[PDB]
Coordinates of C-alpha atoms and ligand atoms in Angstrom, one line a residue:
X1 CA 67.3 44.5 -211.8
X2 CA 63.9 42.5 -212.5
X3 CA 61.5 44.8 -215.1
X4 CA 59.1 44.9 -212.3
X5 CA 61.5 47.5 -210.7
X6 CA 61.4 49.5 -213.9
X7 CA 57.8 49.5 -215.6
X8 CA 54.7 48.5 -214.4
X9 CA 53.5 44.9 -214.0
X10 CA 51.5 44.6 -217.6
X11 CA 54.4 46.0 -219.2
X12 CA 56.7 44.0 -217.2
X13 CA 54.8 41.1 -218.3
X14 CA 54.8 42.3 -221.7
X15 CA 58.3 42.9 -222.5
X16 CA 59.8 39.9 -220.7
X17 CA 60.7 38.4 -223.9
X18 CA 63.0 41.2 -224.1
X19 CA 64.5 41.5 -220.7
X20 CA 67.6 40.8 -221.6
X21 CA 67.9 43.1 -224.0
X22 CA 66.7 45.8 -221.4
X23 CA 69.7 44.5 -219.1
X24 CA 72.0 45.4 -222.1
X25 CA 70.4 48.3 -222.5
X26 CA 71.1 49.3 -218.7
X27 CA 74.8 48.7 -219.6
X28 CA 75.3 50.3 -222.6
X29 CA 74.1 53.5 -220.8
X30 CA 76.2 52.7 -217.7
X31 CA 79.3 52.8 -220.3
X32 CA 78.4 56.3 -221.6
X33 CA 78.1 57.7 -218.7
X34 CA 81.8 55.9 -218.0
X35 CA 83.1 57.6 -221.3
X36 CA 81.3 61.1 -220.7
X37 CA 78.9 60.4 -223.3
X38 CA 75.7 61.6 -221.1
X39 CA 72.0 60.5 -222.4
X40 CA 68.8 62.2 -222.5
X41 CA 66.3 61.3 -220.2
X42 CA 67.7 60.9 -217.0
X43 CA 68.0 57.0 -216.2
X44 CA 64.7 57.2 -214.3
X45 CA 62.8 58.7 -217.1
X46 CA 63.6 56.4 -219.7
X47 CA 61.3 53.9 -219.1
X48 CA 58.6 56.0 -218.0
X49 CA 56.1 55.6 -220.7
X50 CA 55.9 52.3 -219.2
X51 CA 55.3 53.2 -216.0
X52 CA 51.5 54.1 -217.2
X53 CA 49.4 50.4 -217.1
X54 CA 49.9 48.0 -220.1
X55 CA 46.0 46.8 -220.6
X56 CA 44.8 50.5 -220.6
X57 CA 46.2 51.5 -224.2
X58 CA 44.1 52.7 -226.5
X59 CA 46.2 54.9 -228.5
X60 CA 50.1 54.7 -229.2
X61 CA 52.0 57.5 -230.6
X62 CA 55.0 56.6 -232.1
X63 CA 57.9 59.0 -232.4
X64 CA 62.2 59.2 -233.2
X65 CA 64.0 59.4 -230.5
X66 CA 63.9 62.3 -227.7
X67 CA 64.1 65.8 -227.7
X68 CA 68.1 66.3 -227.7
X69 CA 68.1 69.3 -225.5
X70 CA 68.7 69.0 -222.2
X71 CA 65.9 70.1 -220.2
X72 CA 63.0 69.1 -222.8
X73 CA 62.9 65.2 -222.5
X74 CA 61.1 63.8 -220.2
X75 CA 60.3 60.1 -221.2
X76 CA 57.1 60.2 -222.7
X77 CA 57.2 61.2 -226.1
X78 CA 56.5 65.1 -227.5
X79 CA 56.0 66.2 -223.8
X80 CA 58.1 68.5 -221.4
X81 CA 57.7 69.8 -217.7
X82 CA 54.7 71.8 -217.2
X83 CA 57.3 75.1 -216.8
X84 CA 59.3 74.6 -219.6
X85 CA 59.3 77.5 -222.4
X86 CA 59.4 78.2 -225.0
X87 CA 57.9 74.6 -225.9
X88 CA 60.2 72.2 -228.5
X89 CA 59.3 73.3 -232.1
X90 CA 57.4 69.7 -232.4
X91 CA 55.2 69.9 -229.1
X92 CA 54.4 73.7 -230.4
X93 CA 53.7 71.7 -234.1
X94 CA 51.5 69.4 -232.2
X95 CA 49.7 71.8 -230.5
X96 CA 48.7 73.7 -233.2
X97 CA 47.6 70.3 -235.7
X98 CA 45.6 69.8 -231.7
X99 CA 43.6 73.2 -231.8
X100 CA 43.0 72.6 -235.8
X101 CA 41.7 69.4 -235.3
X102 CA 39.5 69.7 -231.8
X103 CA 39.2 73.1 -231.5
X104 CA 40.4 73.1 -227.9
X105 CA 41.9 76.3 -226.6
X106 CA 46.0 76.1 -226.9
X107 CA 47.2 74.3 -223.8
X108 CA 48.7 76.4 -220.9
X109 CA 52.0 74.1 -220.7
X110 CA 53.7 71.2 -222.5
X111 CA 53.0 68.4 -220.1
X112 CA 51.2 65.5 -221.3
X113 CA 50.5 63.7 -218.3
X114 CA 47.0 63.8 -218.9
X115 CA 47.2 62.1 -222.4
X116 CA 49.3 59.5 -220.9
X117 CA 46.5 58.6 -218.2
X118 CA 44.1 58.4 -220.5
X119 CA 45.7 55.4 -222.2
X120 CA 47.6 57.3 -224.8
X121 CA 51.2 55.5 -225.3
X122 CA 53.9 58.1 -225.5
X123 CA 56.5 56.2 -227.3
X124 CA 59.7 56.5 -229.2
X125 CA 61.3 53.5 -231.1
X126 CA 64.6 54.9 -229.8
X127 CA 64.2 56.1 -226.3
X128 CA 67.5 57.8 -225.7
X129 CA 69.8 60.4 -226.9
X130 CA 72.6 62.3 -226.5
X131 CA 72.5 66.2 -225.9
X132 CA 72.8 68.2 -228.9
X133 CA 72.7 64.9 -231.4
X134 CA 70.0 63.7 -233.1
X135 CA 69.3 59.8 -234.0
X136 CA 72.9 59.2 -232.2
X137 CA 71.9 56.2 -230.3
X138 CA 69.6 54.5 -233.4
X139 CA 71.0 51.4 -234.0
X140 CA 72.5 50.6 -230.2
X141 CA 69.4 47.9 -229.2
X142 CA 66.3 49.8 -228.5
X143 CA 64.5 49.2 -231.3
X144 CA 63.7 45.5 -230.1
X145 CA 62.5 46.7 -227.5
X146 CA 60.2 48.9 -228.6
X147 CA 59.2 46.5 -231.5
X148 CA 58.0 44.0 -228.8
X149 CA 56.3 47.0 -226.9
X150 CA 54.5 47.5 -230.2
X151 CA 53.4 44.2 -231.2
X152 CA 53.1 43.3 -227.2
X153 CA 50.0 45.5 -227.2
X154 CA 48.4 44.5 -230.9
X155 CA 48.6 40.8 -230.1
X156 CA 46.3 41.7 -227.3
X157 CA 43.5 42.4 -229.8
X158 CA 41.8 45.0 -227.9
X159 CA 40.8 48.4 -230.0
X160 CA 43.7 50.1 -230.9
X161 CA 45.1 52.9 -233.3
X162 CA 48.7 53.6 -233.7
X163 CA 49.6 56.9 -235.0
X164 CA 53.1 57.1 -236.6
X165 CA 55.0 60.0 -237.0
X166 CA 57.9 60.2 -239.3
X167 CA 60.3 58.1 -240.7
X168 CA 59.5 54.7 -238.9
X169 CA 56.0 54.7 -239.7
X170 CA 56.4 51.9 -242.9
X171 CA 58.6 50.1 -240.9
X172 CA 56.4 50.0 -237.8
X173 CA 53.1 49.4 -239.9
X174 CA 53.7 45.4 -240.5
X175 CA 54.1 45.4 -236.5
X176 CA 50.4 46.3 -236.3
X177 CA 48.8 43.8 -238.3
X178 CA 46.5 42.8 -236.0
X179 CA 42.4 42.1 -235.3
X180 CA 41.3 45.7 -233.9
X181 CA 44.8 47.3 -234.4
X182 CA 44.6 50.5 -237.2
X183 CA 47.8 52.4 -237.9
X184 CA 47.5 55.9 -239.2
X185 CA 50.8 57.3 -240.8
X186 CA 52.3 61.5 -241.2
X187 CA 55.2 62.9 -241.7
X188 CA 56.8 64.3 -238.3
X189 CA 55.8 67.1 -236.2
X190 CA 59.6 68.3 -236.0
X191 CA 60.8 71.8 -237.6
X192 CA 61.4 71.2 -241.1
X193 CA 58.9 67.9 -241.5
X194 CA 55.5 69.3 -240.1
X195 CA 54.8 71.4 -243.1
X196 CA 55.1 68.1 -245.3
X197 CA 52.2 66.7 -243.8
X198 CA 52.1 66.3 -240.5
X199 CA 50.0 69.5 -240.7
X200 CA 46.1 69.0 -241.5
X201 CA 46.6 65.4 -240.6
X202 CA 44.1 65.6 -237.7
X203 CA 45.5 62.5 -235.9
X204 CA 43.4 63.2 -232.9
X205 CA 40.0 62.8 -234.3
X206 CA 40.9 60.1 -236.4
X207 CA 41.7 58.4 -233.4
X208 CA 38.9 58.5 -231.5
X209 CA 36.9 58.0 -235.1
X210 CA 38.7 54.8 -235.7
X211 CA 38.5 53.7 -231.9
X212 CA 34.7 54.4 -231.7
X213 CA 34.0 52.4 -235.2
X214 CA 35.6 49.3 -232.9
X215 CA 33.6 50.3 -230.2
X216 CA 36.2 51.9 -228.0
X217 CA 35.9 54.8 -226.3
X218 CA 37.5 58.0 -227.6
X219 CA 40.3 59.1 -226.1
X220 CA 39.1 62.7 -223.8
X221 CA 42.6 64.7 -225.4
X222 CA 41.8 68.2 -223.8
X223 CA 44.5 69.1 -222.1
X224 CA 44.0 72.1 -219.2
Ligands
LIG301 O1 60.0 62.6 -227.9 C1 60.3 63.1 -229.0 C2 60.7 64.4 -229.1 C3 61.1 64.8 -230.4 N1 61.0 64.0 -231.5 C4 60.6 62.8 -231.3 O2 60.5 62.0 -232.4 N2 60.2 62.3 -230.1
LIG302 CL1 61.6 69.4 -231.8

């Protein structure tokens, strides 16, 4: 089916040159499903930080691959359903680097929705799992895809700051090189990573530092 049926029309746009590849991704999942070999998000989630419009990014967080729990993942990256508890050990991570940082009360539920309207870009450079198995579909084709989502939005030389978390974030930085693109770089929010520096990072107001010294607008990151 046409990526207009997936995403929304400036991402559609955006990731045409990839298309294809999207197609083969469709099938690849079809043929786990075939073999029993289920995948986390559901099919309609996995494009979903997509779904949130191309020209409006300001921000891009860049993550693994989904939570592997069925239940948690939800297709933008870090969040879960508004009644899910208790939250993923890195959206709890997050939260506490987010009331360090802004001093914002802790948020009432994992759902970041808001961010993602705000022009935040909830991604993952792999942006399916399976249940119970980290990292098990790296290597299976989405990482061109999200490499074109990546340099998709710096070749449009708008303000923009990329925060990185975890193991990618070298490999993702080069993708970035761009007039008003910045990357910031951590170790990941996830259980036995946060405490190597993800914590005292304070991505969130280096973001909206680095956006206003373009003259962007920050990026409003209270959450209710
Ligand atoms: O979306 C997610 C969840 C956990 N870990 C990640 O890297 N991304
Ligand atoms: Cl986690």
């Amino acid at each position: 089916r046409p990526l207009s049926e997936l995403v929304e029309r400036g991402w559609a746009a955006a990731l045409e040159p990839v298309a294809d590849q999207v197609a083969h991704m469709g099938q690849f999942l079809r043929a786990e499903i075939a073999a029993g070999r289920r995948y986390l998000p559901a099919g309609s989630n996995v494009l979903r930080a997509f779904t949130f419009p191309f020209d409006n990014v300001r921000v891009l967080i860049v993550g693994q691959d989904p939570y592997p729990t069925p239940g948690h993942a939800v297709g933008l990256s870090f969040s879960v359903a508004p009644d899910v508890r208790p939250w993923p050990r890195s959206l709890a991570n997050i939260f506490d680097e987010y009331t360090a940082d802004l001093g914002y009360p802790l948020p009432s539920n994992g759902d970041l929705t808001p961010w993602a309207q705000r022009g935040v870009l909830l991604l993952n450079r792999v942006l399916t799992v399976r249940p119970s198995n980290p990292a098990s579909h790296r290597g299976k084709g989405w990482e061109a895809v999200t490499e074109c989502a990546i340099r998709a939005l710096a070749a449009r030389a708008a303000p923009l700051v990329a925060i990185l978390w975890g193991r990618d974030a070298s490999t993702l930085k080069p993708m970035l090189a761009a007039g008003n693109c910045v990357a910031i770089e951590s170790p990941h929010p996830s259980p036995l990573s946060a405490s190597r520096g993800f914590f005292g990072s304070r991505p969130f107001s280096r973001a909206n530092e680095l956006l206003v010294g373009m003259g962007a607008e920050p990026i409003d990151w209270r959450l209710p």
